[PDB]
Design a protein around this ligand. Structure first.
Ligand SMILES: Nc1ncnc2c1ncn2[C@@H]1O[C@H](CSCC[C@H](N)C(=O)O)[C@@H](O)[C@H]1O
Ligand SMILES: Nc1ncnc2c1ncn2[C@@H]1O[C@H](CSCC[C@H](N)C(=O)O)[C@@H](O)[C@H]1O
Lengths: 249, 244
């Protein structure tokens, strides 16, 4: 017996981001596992279900909501948490495909390759299930941002650094590039850089109805971005943002 | 009273890469301009037409094949812009309508279309929109079932020439190289490097190879050369992971 586990990218919140390949993988599944709404409102558990429902035409596919484990904030904590998530998946798969021969899908925001834990958690399962893992690409927040601003990611023939807010705060401007895209940033970390010669293309809730886009010289639009971000957060209870920095010195 | 020009990403060769957003933009178009086959077989001009045919359902949308000018680079890009303008003038002479170009992968990533289209802003009453598509980076990682990044870590996306000119990019343990016609990972000391390589990713001809660079370099060279000999063209992409 063999479980085929598909990690299906579903894009950045625009329900039209889903690809035909993703639709096909949903329709081939015996079981689709989706997390229940929890504390993290940015998971948009309802939107995930909506996207699934808009395209699932296989009448036999089971769609099963499950409670995602909570990380122990009082803790290794991340490690135990990911272990617990794997255990939950393993229990769900075993309960619902007890013959252990079948196709199971998880729906992953954006693309599964990009700052997302699902693939590495799934690796834990390889030694406990007869398992093959497949990945279906989805639209990333990087591409959504560039499309919204109608800008290239790269300068002509030039490298690009993709990084995190914390990496920018710990190390400053990355070596060997004039373009940086920052993800996983909860604190507009570009504000800690020298603004000299930097242009920012910023977006919050990109490709969603709440989308806000701001562009300009970092020295001029930093406070505009801080305010827009805080406003969006106050009114919605959560915010996800991403930005591209272009250096011209 | 505007030409709305959509640059529609169409993915890496798999017709199923097309997003719903791309389908919608195709169906909203009055005109879709697609290049005829040329000397460069890697453009897969026929495949672009087929991917369009698989998704376009509006019977009033007109798919028009045009001769793409050939290449110095500035003049070539100017000539391409002039060709699109001539086609738009010819097929939408009232200059009010929706026009689309179908761009391999995502329009943001190592593709000249977006910057060439900028030339038309001053020539037409123009609004430009971009529809994202699956990139070759994502297709490669998906085919190998691997993460792009190490946990919480930076990633460098670069070209074959930048890799040759500067060596291992500073500040990263992960590099993805695009626009490389010659396996430029050979220009690096192989110690501690692992490669995840793919040619013709997400197409029927797909070849995937992974392993320590020293171990699989020649395997990759031969597989690449074999594809190129049998098909007349090849496109490859790879991710390098350093552990030192
Ligand atoms: N709709 C959206 N708008 C702005 N940023 C977004 C976003 N969705 C995701 N992000 C970015 O992605 C980070 C979550 S990590 C998950 C990334 C996802 N796998 C992808 O392919 O995009 C956020 O901190 C933010 O930087
Ligand atoms: N099917 C495929 N397999 C392997 N590499 C590919 C590919 N399609 C595109 N590429 C890569 O992309 C380069 C062309 S530049 C265009 C990139 C495209 N906009 C994108 O988003 O992917 C090639 O030199 C190669 O590095």
């Amino acid at each position: 017996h063999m479980i085929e586990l598909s990690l299906i990218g579903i894009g950045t919140g625009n329900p039209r981001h889903i690809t035909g390949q993703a639709v096909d993988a949903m329709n081939a599944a015996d079981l689709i596992l989706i997390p229940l709404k929890g504390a993290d409102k940015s998971d948009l558990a309802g939107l995930r279900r909506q996207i699934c429902a808009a395209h699932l035409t296989n009448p036999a596919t089971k769609v099963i909501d499950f409670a995602l484990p909570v990380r122990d904030a009082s803790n290794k904590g991340v490690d135990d948490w990911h272990d617990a998530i794997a255990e939950t998946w393993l229990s769900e798969i075993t309960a619902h495909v007890p013959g252990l021969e079948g196709r199971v899908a998880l729906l992953v925001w954006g693309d599964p390759s990009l700052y997302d834990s699902t693939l590495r958690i799934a690796e834990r399962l390889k030694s406990r299930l007869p398992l093959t893992t497949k990945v279906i690409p989805g639209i990333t927040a990087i591409q959504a941002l560039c499309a919204a601003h109608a800008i290239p990611l790269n300068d002509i023939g030039a490298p690009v650094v993709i990084t995190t807010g914390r990496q920018l705060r710990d190390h400053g401007w990355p070596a060997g590039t004039e373009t940086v895209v920052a993800m996983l940033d909860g604190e507009c970390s570009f504000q800690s850089l020298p603004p000299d010669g930097l242009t920012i293309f910023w977006g919050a809730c990109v490709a969603m109805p709440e989308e806000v886009l701001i562009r300009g010289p970092v020295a001029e639009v930093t406070d505009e971005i801080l305010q827009a971000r805080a406003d969006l957060r106050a009114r919605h209870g959560w915010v996800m943002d991403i930005y591209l920095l272009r250096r011209n010195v």
